[PDB]
Amino acid sequence: SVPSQKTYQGSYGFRLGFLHSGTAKSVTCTYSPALNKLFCQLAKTCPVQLWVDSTPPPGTRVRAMAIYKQSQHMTEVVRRCPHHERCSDSDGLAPPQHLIRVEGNLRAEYLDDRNTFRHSVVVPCEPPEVGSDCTTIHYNYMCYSSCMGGMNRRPILTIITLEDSSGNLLGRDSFEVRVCACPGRDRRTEEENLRKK
Numbered sequence: 001s002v003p004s005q006k007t008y009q010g011s012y013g014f015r016l017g018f019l020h021s022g023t024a025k026s027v028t029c030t031y032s033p034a035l036n037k038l039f040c041q042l043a044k045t046c047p048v049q050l051w052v053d054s055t056p057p058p059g060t061r062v063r064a065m066a067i068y069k070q071s072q073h074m075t076e077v078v079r080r081c082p083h084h085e086r087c088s089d090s091d092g093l094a095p096p097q098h099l100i101r102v103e104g105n106l107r108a109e110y111l112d113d114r115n116t117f118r119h120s121v122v123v124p125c126e127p128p129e130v131g132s133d134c135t136t137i138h139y140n141y142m143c144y145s146s147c148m149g150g151m152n153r154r155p156i157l158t159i160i161t162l163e164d165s166s167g168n169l170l171g172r173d174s175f176e177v178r179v180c181a182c183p184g185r186d187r188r189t190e191e192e193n194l195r196k197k
């Protein structure tokens, strides 16, 4: 009824990482460690790093799914709003209803769960390129947090799960997301509100 959000490193030491993009007015994606919250513009690249302490088996995959953060909304499927699901902006692979897309990965698969109706996007787990210490997935969020008839100002969390080839859990991490026009300003405001509290 509600997917778990419990952080779980598992046998491979799985966890996420984020770049340090700052809070300038022009920034398009920025992550707040103090809030565990990503702030991003609509349909812009969100680099999310994957870190492990040891190599998971061939066939391991990485799934992303959004849920509402507030308990009274957690059973509602997070989906694109009535405008954005109809705006014909598909990449040829993501269903138009899905909030979260993966950029530039032809092996991405989009699931409409037959029992929960929830949406997710899953890719093969890949090792870092030679010379790199981690792997990065580029996500896009395809509605604003404020979109009426969709998220409608309700905060969401993205849950990233490392899965075996059957879909069994190997690791889990998560972060809050706000999709907004000015992520740098909103991160600064929310961090200041946190400090004042």
Ligand SMILES: CCn1c2ccc(C[NH2+]C)cc2c2ccc(-c3ccc(C)s3)cc21
Pocket (backbone or CB within 6 Å): 050, 051, 052, 053, 054, 055, 056, 057, 058, 059, 060, 124, 125, 126, 127, 128, 132, 133, 134, 135
């Ligand atoms: C989570 C991304 N990923 C890593 C992230 C950070 C580091 C540490 N760097 C210093 C190693 C790996 C790593 C090693 C192997 C693999 C895979 C092998 C076979 C697969 C199907 S995935 C994935 C990996």
Ligand SMILES: [Zn+2]
Pocket (backbone or CB within 6 Å): 080, 081, 082, 083, 084, 085, 142, 143, 144, 147, 148, 150
């Ligand atoms: Zn929308």
